[PDB]
Design an enzyme around this catalytic site. Structure first.
Site, PDB file in Angstrom:
ATOM      1  N   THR A  14      -5.799   6.188   8.672  1.00 16.99           N
ATOM      2  CA  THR A  14      -6.403   6.470   7.343  1.00 16.99           C
ATOM      3  C   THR A  14      -6.405   5.229   6.455  1.00 16.99           C
ATOM      4  O   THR A  14      -6.862   5.327   5.318  1.00 16.99           O
ATOM      5  CB  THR A  14      -5.709   7.629   6.638  1.00 16.99           C
ATOM      6  OG1 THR A  14      -4.403   7.163   6.254  1.00 16.99           O
ATOM      7  CG2 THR A  14      -5.699   8.870   7.498  1.00 16.99           C
ATOM      8  N   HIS A  34       5.769   6.887   6.612  1.00 13.86           N
ATOM      9  CA  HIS A  34       5.399   6.519   5.243  1.00 13.86           C
ATOM     10  C   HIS A  34       4.783   7.768   4.612  1.00 13.86           C
ATOM     11  O   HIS A  34       4.556   8.747   5.267  1.00 13.86           O
ATOM     12  CB  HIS A  34       4.405   5.350   5.253  1.00 13.86           C
ATOM     13  CG  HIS A  34       3.141   5.696   5.950  1.00 13.86           C
ATOM     14  ND1 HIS A  34       2.993   5.494   7.295  1.00 13.86           N
ATOM     15  CD2 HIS A  34       1.985   6.282   5.533  1.00 13.86           C
ATOM     16  CE1 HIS A  34       1.827   5.998   7.674  1.00 13.86           C
ATOM     17  NE2 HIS A  34       1.181   6.492   6.593  1.00 13.86           N
ATOM     18  N   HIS A  42       3.527  10.882   6.846  1.00 17.68           N
ATOM     19  CA  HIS A  42       2.997  10.523   8.184  1.00 17.68           C
ATOM     20  C   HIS A  42       4.098   9.912   9.031  1.00 17.68           C
ATOM     21  O   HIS A  42       4.583   8.839   8.675  1.00 17.68           O
ATOM     22  CB  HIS A  42       1.842   9.540   8.027  1.00 17.68           C
ATOM     23  CG  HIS A  42       0.643  10.202   7.440  1.00 17.68           C
ATOM     24  ND1 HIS A  42      -0.380   9.452   6.870  1.00 17.68           N
ATOM     25  CD2 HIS A  42       0.312  11.504   7.324  1.00 17.68           C
ATOM     26  CE1 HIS A  42      -1.295  10.272   6.441  1.00 17.68           C
ATOM     27  NE2 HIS A  42      -0.923  11.536   6.696  1.00 17.68           N
ATOM     28  N   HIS A  86       0.850  -1.223   0.000  1.00 19.04           N
ATOM     29  CA  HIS A  86       0.000   0.000   0.000  1.00 19.04           C
ATOM     30  C   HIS A  86       0.871   1.253   0.000  1.00 19.04           C
ATOM     31  O   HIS A  86       0.441   2.288  -0.510  1.00 19.04           O
ATOM     32  CB  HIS A  86      -1.059   0.088   1.110  1.00 19.04           C
ATOM     33  CG  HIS A  86      -0.786  -0.426   2.478  1.00 19.04           C
ATOM     34  ND1 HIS A  86      -0.575   0.421   3.593  1.00 19.04           N
ATOM     35  CD2 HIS A  86      -0.919  -1.678   2.964  1.00 19.04           C
ATOM     36  CE1 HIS A  86      -0.500  -0.330   4.677  1.00 19.04           C
ATOM     37  NE2 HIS A  86      -0.672  -1.619   4.308  1.00 19.04           N
TER      38      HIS A  86
HETATM   39 ZN   LIG Z   1      -0.567   7.469   6.456  1.00 15.80          ZN
END
Ligand SMILES: [Zn+2]
Length: 257
Positions: free
Chosen positions: A195, A91, A116, A61
């Protein structure tokens, strides 16, 4: 399983993670005129001098730069936070083109990407216990705009060829995350969520006002990563962002006038 495609993206997540439609979901649009200056908010304390990065991972992801969080080496405190939060990983989220990619928005402006830096509250002893608590995590969000190169990002960019596909990792020692911060630590803060699934409502969000600048070549290298595993059909890792969610009964506070 979940992802960012037409068939498994954000509008599908609620079916396996019903908290997707909860009362404190992230990200949100930051309406700069509605955010209240809160003179009781403290300056952020970012203490990354002893940070120990270990590894970088393509998890299918995004990519995570992981840190040793077995002692108070890289900690966030102050700002809106009570106590001490240990850095576990950072990330990014980014777009297929420079006009999208951030998760938070500012007066509906989308940035090219968002960093983040994920921290957990030491009072809960481990990350897995912290995500079960409303004050378990503090995520420091930093916007990326495309312009000048960010020198402190280049070590990250140059290792991405070695983790192109899902499940690949590489040694990533001696990386200093101070090189990813803007000059100002002025921020907005609100209570929210992870998120990505499991979308747990355990985050104190701290979103810096000042973006960092990265070059077009730096972000282009992010977009060469793959969501897929090795020897699978190539799916470029782009548009790995969740859109803004309803603010509901929340107040965004500003650290600055
Ligand atoms: Zn994030």
């Amino acid at each position: 399983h979940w992802g960012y495609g037409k068939h498994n993206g954000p509008e599908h997540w609620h079916k396996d993670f019903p908290i997707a439609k909860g009362e404190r979901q992230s990200p949100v649009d930051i309406d700069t005129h509605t955010a209240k200056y809160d003179p009781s908010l403290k300056p952020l304390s970012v203490s990354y001098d002893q940070a120990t990065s270990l590894r970088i991972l393509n998890n299918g992801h995004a990519f995570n730069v992981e840190f040793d969080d077995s002692q108070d080496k890289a900690v966030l405190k102050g700002g809106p936070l009570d106590g001490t939060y240990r850095l576990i990983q950072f990330h990014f989220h980014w777009g297929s083109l420079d006009g999208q990619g951030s998760e938070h928005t500012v007066d509906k402006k989308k940035y090219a990407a968002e960093l983040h830096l994920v921290h957990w509250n030491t009072k809960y002893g481990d990350f897995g216990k912290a995500v079960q608590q409303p004050d378990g995590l503090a995520v420091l969000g930093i916007f990326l705009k495309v312009g000048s190169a960010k020198p402190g990002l280049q070590k990250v960019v140059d290792v991405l060829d070695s983790i192109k596909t899902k499940g690949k990792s590489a040694d990533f020692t001696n990386f200093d995350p101070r090189g990813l911060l803007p000059e100002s630590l002025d921020y907005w803060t609100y209570p929210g969520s992870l998120t990505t699934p499991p979308l747990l409502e355990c985050v104190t969000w701290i979103v810096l006002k000042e973006p960092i600048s990265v070059s077009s070549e730096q972000v282009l290298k992010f977009r060469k990563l793959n969501f897929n595993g090795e020897g699978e059909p190539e799916e470029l890792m782009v548009d790995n962002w969740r859109p803004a969610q309803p603010l509901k009964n929340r107040q965004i506070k500003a650290s600055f006038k």
